[PDB]
Amino acid sequence: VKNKCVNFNFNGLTGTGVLTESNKKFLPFQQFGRDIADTTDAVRDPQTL
Amino acid sequence: FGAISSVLNDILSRLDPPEAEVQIDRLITGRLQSLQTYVTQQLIRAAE
Amino acid sequence: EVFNATRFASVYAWNRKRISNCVADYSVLYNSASFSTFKCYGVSPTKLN
Numbered sequence: 539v540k541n542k543c544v545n546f547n548f549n550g551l552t553g554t555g556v557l558t559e560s561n562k563k564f565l566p567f568q569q570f571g572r573d574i575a576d577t578t579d580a581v582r583d584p585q586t587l
Numbered sequence: 588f589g590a591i592s593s594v595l596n597d598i599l600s601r602l603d604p605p606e607a608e609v610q611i612d613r614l615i616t617g618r619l620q621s622l623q624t625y626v627t628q629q630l631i632r633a634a635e
Numbered sequence: 636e637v638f639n640a641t642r643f644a645s646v647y648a649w650n651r652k653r654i655s656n657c658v659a660d661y662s663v664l665y666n667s668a669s670f671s672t673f674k675c676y677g678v679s680p681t682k683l684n
């Protein structure tokens with residue numbers, strides 16, 4: 539579910555926020571991304587990649 | 588700050604409250620100390 | 636094949652087996668009365684699932 543504040547548990551990574559389509563592109567070895575302050579900012583879907 | 592991890596969610600989902608309380612307390616102490624330092628610096632700079 | 640096995644190696648040659656690419660249900664092991672000792676360090680026994 540997207541565009542709604544939800545609790546998410548992505549492959550054991552728990553949190554709360556809004557999930558949305560990402561313009562960023564991940565190399566085919568990276569699983570999640572972090573900001574300049576190292577705050578989690580993106581996640582790769584285990585079932586959709 | 589001496590805790591097992593720097594993420595509160597990991598500590599919460601990995602440990603029971605009686606044993607996670609110590610780690611949460613260490614994180615609270617560290618973050619409170621950092622916030623007080625920031626507030627004091629801001630007060631001095633605001634006076635200037 | 637590890638818990639319910641017939642041969643257990645010697646203590647100084649303890650047998651290590653790697654577990655990956657599967658789904659593990661620790662609740663059935665923890666709730667079973669067959670084990671007389673079940674203690675976890677760095678994680679609680681009810682949160683492995």
Ligand SMILES: *[C@@H]1O[C@H](CO)[C@@H](O)[C@H](O)[C@H]1NC(C)=O
Nearest residue numbers: 549566582583584585586587
């Ligand atoms: C199963 O995994 C494959 C490979 O990632 C994926 O393409 C497919 O959509 C998955 N199927 C289901 C039902 O999730």
